[model samples]
Every structure is written in C-alpha cells, then in structure tokens.
Target: DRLQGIVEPIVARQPLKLGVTVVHLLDNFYKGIAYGIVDEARRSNVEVVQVAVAGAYGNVQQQFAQLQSFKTLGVDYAVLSPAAYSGYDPVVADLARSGIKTISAGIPVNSDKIAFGVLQDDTLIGKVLGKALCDDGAQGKQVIVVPGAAGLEWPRLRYEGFKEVASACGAKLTPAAFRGEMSLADGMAQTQDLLMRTPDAEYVFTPVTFLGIGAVRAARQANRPVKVLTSAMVKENEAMIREGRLLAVASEPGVIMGRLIVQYAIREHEGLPMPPLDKPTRSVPYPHFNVPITVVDKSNVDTHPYAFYDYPPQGWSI
Candidate 1:
C-alpha cells in the first residue's frame, strides 16, 4: 500500500508480540484489518499473540476487558477497533500511562495517548459517493440521503463529507436525511418514506449495501425511476451494480487499511514521527486517520480492489 512507503519493511530488533482487538472479527472489513496486522507482522518477524473479538459490535464491557488485557497480557502493541465513540478514552489513556502503547484501528478512540487511529476515511468515502451523484448530473436535482445510524462517528463523518460535496454541486436533498438502523428493511422503509415525500427524487444515497438494496426494492415497488448510491463496496454489490440495481459504490479496500494499521504500529514502535494530515487521504483534529476511497461503477467494477478476493487472509484466528 502507499502508506507503507512512509515506513518501509524491517524486522523488529527482537521478536515482538502484537494484539489485535476489534469489535467484529467475522466481518470482511475488520477481518482484512486483522489479516493485514498478521501478515505485516510476519513480514517484520513480529508475532501476533492474540486476535481478540469483543463478542459483538459495540460490546463496551467486553472491549474494555480486552483493552485491559492488552495491558495485563504483556503484549508490546495492540490495535483496537473501539465499540463506541469516546467511551474508551480513559482506559486508553490509562493503558498509555501503563506503558502498553496502542493504536486505534478501524474505529477511533479519541485518545491522544494512543499512537494514532487508523480509520476508513468515512468522510472521503462520503465525498466519493457525493461525487458519483454529481457526476450523474444530480445538480439541482433531488438526491435523497439515508445517512445510516445516527450518533456514530463513521456515519456522521461520511454524511459531512457527502453533504459538503453534494451541496457544493447544487444537489438538492430533503431537509433532513433518514438516520436509522443499517439494515435492508430499514433502508427499504426509509426509501419508501423518502419517495413518498419527494416522489421525483432522482437518486437515493445510502451508506452501505443492504440499505442500497432496500432503496432499490422500494423504488421498484413505487414504480419510480430512482437510482441508489452507496459505500462499503462488496462482491455481491458488484453484481447488483452490473444488474442496474445499484448506481455505484465508494470503496475503500480494507486490506490496505489493515496493512497500513500494522505499518503504523511498527513505525510507532521503532520511534518514527507520524505523518501529518493529508486531506482526502489522511486527516486530523483527532486521532482519526483516513484512507483513500475509490468510486466504482459498472464500467470499472471488474477492476475494483474490493470486488473480488476481498476476504480475511487465511490461516489466522482469534
């Protein structure tokens, strides 16, 4: 990945143990993060002692327990995908004081103590999605937005990015976006409501695949000619794009994010200065780090990094 150029591969001075604690190990995205950590560690001759799962997404108690274990287990470094926004600040700060350095990965922890946080650049992904809409001549046209769950960091950031671009390009959205559960049914229901309100809405922008599916279904049910744009591209969604069920997706490959996270860990361990914010790729104001997003359409869906073979690198488990 381009992030590796900043800190090239090098074996550790001694065999080092790194712990990976994330919210969902089975998820294809986080799984790539875990795989990147292990593979990069292998390249550097570092040992991944444990890959811990916190049971389910947003399991604060279990995630906190794992954070505590990172301090108690004697691992040299750990990458955390926090369950909640800002809930683990004190604990992460405590870990720093205890000399067990960590880097927040996949999710931001908002602690300056942690070396840094590696995130998917949700804002960038959003901007990409917005650009897709703009490119489709959405200027001054109705583009209904479904911003996914509310009060979450990624969704909020993504919405901001999307709003920034969509608004700039004169894309008109309903006064408010639908903020609800990130499920197919919810997306379908939300789109149904949006269409009822803005029947002539040219496109419905969703935050993820299932939501896009739901929106497409809703549009079909209403017999309204509307397109759906989404993010977090996956294999199945590529088929939907080809089938004209989805407009397109903004994709940020997880393997690159995962590999970059481990590389950041190694750089921090080796006492190197972290890079400053590089907008649309890496940004700041917190521990959050952003990755690049690629807009994938039917024409180029076959060549997208996440279209095929996007999975957990084999032979590693929590």
Candidate 2:
C-alpha cells in the first residue's frame, strides 16, 4: 500500500538485498515492524537475503555472531535493533568498515559509521503521555512514574520529558515504580506495590505501553480511580481504551521507522554523511513528524488503526 509505493522505486533501481537482525522475533511490536519491511520489500521486488533471529538469551553474543555471518554472506545492507546498549559498538564498526550500510532502530549505538537511526522520539513520547494527563485534567493530582528498564537512555529521556510537562501542570510526582521489563505482569506487580504504598495517588504515568496495561488492570482490581497513561499505542491496549479503562496512550509509527532506516541506508551508502551523532546515539526526527505520538483514548483510538494496532492480523502466519 503506502509502503509499497515508497519502496518500489528504491528496490526496482537497486534491488535491495537487505538483512534484518532483531533481538527477538516474539515481541509483537518488533514483529510488526519486521513484517512491514518484508511486505514492502516484496512488493517493491527487493529481496531479503536472510533474517537473523535470536531469542533474548545471551542476545548480545547471539547478535554479534549473526552480524559476523552477514558480513560473510556479503550483505548489501542491514537493519538492526541492538540487544545491549553499548555492546554493539564493535559489531557496528566492523559492518560499516566492511562497506556494508547499517541502519539502527529501537536501540541506538552512537556511531557516525552507523548510517542512520530510526526510532521513536523518546522526548516527545514522554511529553505526549504527560500532556495527555494534563489535558484530561490530571493536573494538580498525585502522579506516579513507571520507569521502563533501567540502564537504557531512552527510558530516562522519556521520563525527563514527561516530568517537565507534568511539573508545569502542577502534578505532584511521587517515587518511581521501576518496572523490570516492559510487560503486563511486571507492571501489575509494580502498580500493586505502589497502590499499597500510596493509596491516594490519582494518576499513574507509564511511559511504556505494556506496563501501562498492567497498571490499568491493577488500578481496576484495587478499586482505585487512578487514571492510567502511557506511551505506545499497542493493539492489545485498544480494547482497554474502548472500554474506557485507559485514559490516553502515546503511539509510535513503526512502518515509518522501518522505511526511514531503509531510506537513510541508501543515502549513507551514496556517501551522504549524516549529522554528528548525539552524545549517547543518533536520533533523526521523522521528516514529517518522524516520531509522531498520537494521543489515543476512547475518542481517538479508532482514528489510528495502524498506530494502535499490530498489522497482518492475528493467527495468520509466523
């Protein structure tokens, strides 16, 4: 559809031989983006030589091995989602030095050698979720922060952005709820603990989608009237939003992220140098609002089919 149109020329001209190395294929969000790339590449006659797959177990070592194999296979270009924050530096350097264009998504490795990065605007993601609570009149309310996985810059950046907006709105920030991973059960457990500790908090600010889901469920079980807010418009969260269980969700455009990586790879391969990498990484804002965060609730949930939901439908293919 829209992706096919954009990639058609690129593939027809150069016939992309792209390789995608993902940390894990089981994550619905990453799977959605991978599928979009495959579909667009197929429609455009671009061939994917092979997709490097690995489980979460020893992800760093597994991905490094996969990257080495791609070089042996003489891959033309690669789209990668790093497993560990700083461990991929050597792999990225080796790939770029071998004349292979590498595009980063999700986790960014600070390297000009890495052709480009395609990611959600973490700052805007935080601001959008924070602003949604304010817009819903959660200002002047007691708010709890749910920190997504520690040691990652994106989560911290997102927290900083959310704090700025929440502070201006007169919301009182409480101690953080550090979610072990971005999951429903972890979020529920964390929210449950917070509920027991602060029964008077009026709102829960979760910058990640899955955690937000758990927070909402926990609030319901506790019979608390806390409004739940989070980032990422995951499809599973749609029903909750429609049922009025969710106050607002900030969404990311995965398809746009995928295409942007491809486009940047092409440009970089053509010797078009990118701007200086950010301190910790390189973040290229979506040309037309690259990381557009859509605020979805019962009101606008239906308006964002792609943003709020995973594509290819469920129970189809692996």
Candidate 3:
C-alpha cells in the first residue's frame, strides 16, 4: 500500500484543477516526489492541468514565471518546490491573493502565503546522521561535511545541525568546508580537493545524496577509505549502502509526501481539515510543516520502505 492507497473522493465543482511544479524532475529525489504526485492525482478527483519544472535547479526566475502563469491559466491550486527558501515568497503571495492556493513541497516557501507544507526538517535530518556517526564511535575522529548549494534552507540548516551534534559528540571537523552547486560533477571536484587537504578524515557527510555519492567516488579514485553519510536514498545509493561502499543516509518518503501534498490541496479546495498542516514544529513563525526523516543503512536498507526513495516513473518530459 506504499505506492497505491485508497483516497476518499472530495467533492468539487467540475473536478478541481491542480498545477504541480518543481525545481527539476531530473534529480532522483525530485523524480520520486513528482511520481508520487502523478500517481496520487491519478486516483483522485483532480485534473493535473500542467506539471511543470524549472528549466533546471536554482532557476528561480523560471519558476517564478511559471507560478505567475498559473494565475491566468485557471489553475485553482499549485504544489511548489521552490529553489530558494524565500525567493518564491512574493510570487506565492501573489497567487494567494489571486485566490489560487499554493502548497509548499520538499522546500518550504518561508511565508504564510503557502497553504501548507510537507518537507523533511533539514536540521533534524542532519542531526540524525550526526547521531548515527557519533554512535559509531566518531568521538575523536576527523569529519568533513559537504553542504550542497549554499544559502539553501536544507543545506545550510543541515550543516548547522550536523556540526552542533557532531561537535558535542567530540567529533573534529575540518575548518573551512566547501559549498557549491548540488551536482555529481561539482561534488566530485569539491570532494577531490577536500580529500587532498584532509587526508586523515575518517568520515565525510554530504547533506545531499549527489554530493555524498560523488564524495564516495572521489575517495575511491584517490584510494582513500572513509565512511560517507548522505541524504536521499535512491536505488544506487541504496545498493552502495548494502555493499558497504557507503555508511548511511538521511532520507524522506517522497512518494508519501507527494501524495499527502496533493491530498492537502484537495482538502483546501473542498473545505476540509489538513491534519499535516496543523503542526509547525521546525519553525513556529512560518506556516510551513515538516515530515519525518528516515535513516537508512546496511542493516535495514533492504527492509526499509523502498518507495521512499524508489525509482521514478519513466520519461523526463512528463
């Protein structure tokens, strides 16, 4: 029942329309989310008017433009995965005033303009890995953290949380860590250089899966041995964990989250309660909400919910 679940129909005039948008569907994480939305909408009384993606990750202008277009396109609601924390706040507010509700997904919009949000608490997520590493006896070991995409809420907050717990646990981190675009090639470059400077590092933590995976490959290429803690447990990363090539991951259930976001949007349209939106644990000021983070390692990677970070539907243009 992970991927497929029963969704009670919500009454609406002329089958409500929803617009779904994300930073990009190319990333395994985003793909998992998009698939969840698609699959869930398929079983609900929602006409997915148009599922759009920013031309690429971090394309705030493109996403803003798309959000603007939704108002005139007659979309009653939208699911937005913003590129930056507050970059889309104005646009989202504009949409709200126009009587079109927007739901924040994956990344929170940092404003009340969003009807509700479903995302992983990044700070808590980082602490999960730090606690794991600390439990693994990292007391005096040297560690390095690669926070993908500087200034983004997830990366920055995760970095802060990891450092706090790891420091308390007596772990030593290399000074002046690196931050850049969250991509395999950039991760490889950053990891390769960092490895050279800190040859005694025992473990590397990347807040994003791509960076961690790249760091692992970089360490292998340089013939170095180190445990890597990462985010987003896609199939490749799952296999790596099983094979002992990587340490562990802090991931979220994108499919479930995607489905929940759609369900919440419908609730708003139908004048029903959105239970998930009731709690705001991460930040009280913002109306954004968070979801639980799952820690996956070799011991339970196989037994864990695979659909949380499973393979997405085929075809990128969807």
Shift of residue 36 alpha carbon in model 2, Å: 1.6
**Candidate 3, 1-318: lDDT as tens digits:** 552343454434446778888887756677777777777677776677888888666688988888888888889887888776666778878998898888877865566667777777888888998898898899999997677775466677788888899999999987545456788887788889888888899898888777887898898998888889988776788778877767878876676777776776777777776554445544423455466677888888878875444556555336
Cα lDDT tens digits for candidate 2, 237-310: 88877776678877655655555555555544555544333433343322222444567777777776664234
2 against 3, candidate with superior TM-score:
3
TM-score of each: 0.85, 0.85, 0.91
User: Model 3: which residue pairs collide?
Assistant: none
Per-residue CA lDDT of candidate 1, range 63-89, in tens? 788878878778887778766665676
Worst window of 10 by summed lDDT in candidate 3: 3-12
Better of 1 and 2 by lDDT: 1
Error of 1 at 241 (Å): 1.9
Ranking by TM-score: 3, 2, 1
The local distance difference test score of each candidate is 0.72, 0.68, 0.76
> Using TM-score as the measure, which candidate wins?
3
**Residue 54 displacement (Å), model 2:** 4.5
Backbone clashes for every candidate come to 0, 2, 0
Compared with the true structure, model 1 gives a TM-score of 0.85
TM-score of 2: 0.85
Clashing pairs in 2: 232-250, 286-290
